[PDB]
Symmetry: C4
Subunit: 91 residues, 4 copies
């Protein structure tokens, strides 16, 4: 479950990285950063897509990627972080 | 259920598109982009409504649209994306 | 329930409006806008508190106000918007 | 439960404060502010990490810290704010 969500999240982020570096001309690390803050809904305070293609893609990317990204975060904290802490709270 | 949430989300986004292009003078695609990043809570790092009418509308728009948009995303991932993946995980 | 959450949300937003217009010098409508986009986690793409007092207050404001604001939005969509739609879907 | 989430949230915020003030050169209060708005997903409208180290760290920080921060907010409102209000609604 966690493994599949991990892989799915990775593939989604790879797609955004390729898209923004190609269409919006961002350096790969910047494209990845933008993809991450966008899908986690944090948002970037400096960059907004400048092309209409980038704006349309971002709209679709958000609706399709948000659910998955948060599902991964949800399990990452409940089935991976909680135990390491919950069991670690046992005297 | 998903169909109704889809239509409801579309109508809400259309309202924002019309509002921002008219009152804030944004190009339709920019008004739509702003409506989407606002209701999904991602936020836009460059534009903020400049008119008091735009600020008041955005406040109301956020409170009324956020629940619906996320309800749609919630079902889009649970009743449309999960299956295509869950069933696809069957050897 | 909805009435109490409504009043509680109003009081919280009033506090932010007074704080930002006084300490950060924002026009009341701008202070209210900033309080709303901050507590709904949308964020503002132009303004960030400039004083240390404003930064500390915003940090505390976020942790204390986010839960309430979303609890209100949660009920506003489930116990006020859903019915008007759910019952409206009855032929 | 609430105490542990409180401590865990504090430690996470301390880590971000140290990281951003050291690598991104922010004043401690600004590093803390950025860490808070980033993990609560509000986002900052002015600052984005400028170094590649800062961008990579922020990406990892977001995925690891978001779940915890919201778990704390979740309990802070349900097991600390609700009662003080729920019991306060008793004539
Ligand atoms: K900005
Ligand atoms: K700017
Ligand atoms: K957000
Ligand atoms: K933002
Ligand atoms: K945001
Ligand atoms: K922003």
């Amino acid at each position: 479950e966690f493994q599949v969500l991990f892989v799915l999240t990775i593939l989604t982020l790879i797609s955004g990285t390729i898209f923004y570096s190609t269409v919006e001309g961002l350096r790969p690390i910047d494209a990845l950063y933008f993809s991450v803050v966008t899908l986690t809904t944090v948002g970037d305070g400096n960059f907004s897509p400048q092309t209409d293609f980038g704006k349309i893609f971002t709209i679709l990317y958000i609706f399709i990627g948000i659910g998955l990204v948060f599902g991964f975060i949800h399990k990452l904290a409940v089935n991976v972080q909680l135990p390491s802490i919950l069991s670690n709270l046992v005297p």
